[PDB]
A paper describes a structure:
Pectin methylesterases (PMEs, EC 3.1.1.11 and CE8) are important enzymes influencing the digestibility of plant cell wall material by cleaving the methoxylated groups attached to pectin and releasing methanol that are then used by methylotrophic methanogens in the rumen. Here, we present the crystal structures of PMEs belonging to the carbohydrate esterase family 8 (CE8) from Butyrivibrio proteoclasticus and Butyrivibrio fibrisolvens, determined to a resolution of 2.30 Å.
The Apo crystal structure of Pme8A was determined to a maximum resolution of 2.30 Å with three monomers in the asymmetric unit. The monoclinic crystals of Pme8A revealed continuous electron density of the main chain in only one of the three monomers, with the exclusion being the L2 loop (residues 204–214), which forms immediately adjacent to the presumed pectin or substrate binding site of the enzyme (monomer A; residues 4–341 excluding residues 207–213, monomer B; residues 5–341 and monomer C; residues 4–341 excluding residues 208–213). Similar to other published PmeA structures, Pme8A is a right-handed parallel β-helical structure of eight complete coils formed by a set of three β-strands. This structure is maintained in part by an internal core of hydrophobic amino acids and some, particularly phenylalanine, are placed at equivalent positions or stacked on neighbouring coils. For Pme8A, these include Ile36, Phe56, Val99, Phe129, Tyr172, Phe192, Phe235, and Phe265. The N-terminal domain is formed by a single β-strand and α-helix (α1; residues 5–32), which also runs parallel with the β-strands coils, while the C-terminal terminates in a single α-helix (α2; residues 321–341). Extending from the β-strands in several instances are solvent exposed loops that connect them to labelled L1 (146–167), which forms the largest loop at the base of the presumed active site of the enzyme and L2 (204–214), formed in part by two alpha helical half turns immediately adjacent to L1. In the Apo form, the Pme8A active site cleft measures approximately 27.5 Å (L1-L2) long, 18 Å wide, and 7 Å deep when measured along these structural elements. Conserved residues at the catalytic centre, necessary for substrate binding or transition state stabilisation, are identified as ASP139, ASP182, and Arg255.
Residue numbers in the entry: 4 to 206, 214 to 341
Write the structure that this text describes.
Amino acid sequence: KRMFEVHVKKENGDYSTITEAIQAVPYEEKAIIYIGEGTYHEKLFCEKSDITFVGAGIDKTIIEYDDGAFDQMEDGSKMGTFRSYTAFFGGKRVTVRNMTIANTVGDGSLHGQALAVYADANICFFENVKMTGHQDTLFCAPLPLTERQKNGFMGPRVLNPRKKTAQLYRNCEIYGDVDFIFGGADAVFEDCLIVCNNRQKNVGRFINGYITAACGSRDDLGFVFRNCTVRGEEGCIEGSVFLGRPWRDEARTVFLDCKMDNSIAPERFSGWGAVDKDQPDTYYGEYRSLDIIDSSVIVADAKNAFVKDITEKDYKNLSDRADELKKKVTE
């Protein structure tokens, strides 16, 4: 079996840091980095043709860093969203399994956006990975076409083309509050636990968060959640957590056969900048959402009018498309 292998351990490894292991890997070589138990306080930048990272399991291998968008850089500039990442995964194919990746800086009101993971590779596959943060925990590239704020995309891909990506998340746990899964990827989340933090404790109607903030094209797949558990953290007030708001106007995000509780807002999805702002070019929706406790069917007839009614035909389409992205990624 030919594969370039590197073993990271706190003691007796090839290296004691992940960064040094990444350096070791030649871009063009199919590689795997095994990472032993421990907490690795590092900011990772990985760009490779075909690499796999395998930790010792969720909360056994932990990659953590604490950069926030509001931080000041040496040159005087604000770090910004897209430089806050604990880990950047770019290149052609990346696989990550059996670890926690955390941005520990804190709530966005004091520290700004703070990515745990910047997922930029053409094809990304996360399995049994836990990702924690507050604002903007997980970015699934690509960026929108153009910025609305000066230097809004400052980061490693600001100059680059907006490459479409295909991402698969299986058995992951993802924690955050405001826009904590966002970007323009075609991304399927399967059998994931997705939890909005109780922002109200970390700081009219109080809004704890927006699970998604997609910005893809109306002709692409966008975010598909299937058989996931989606909810606020224990303590979140009723109806204070949205399934999404559209970061750009053709946002696509669907939840198929998911379990949810009553922390989820009655409107289900928000407009951008105000709850009841119309977003007629989004494809936002739920199909067969079940209550988490008793598996009884959820009915929301107070959803925003722009939220779609997923017919059985729409559902088979979304399922087939999610299925073909899964094949592309795992094939």
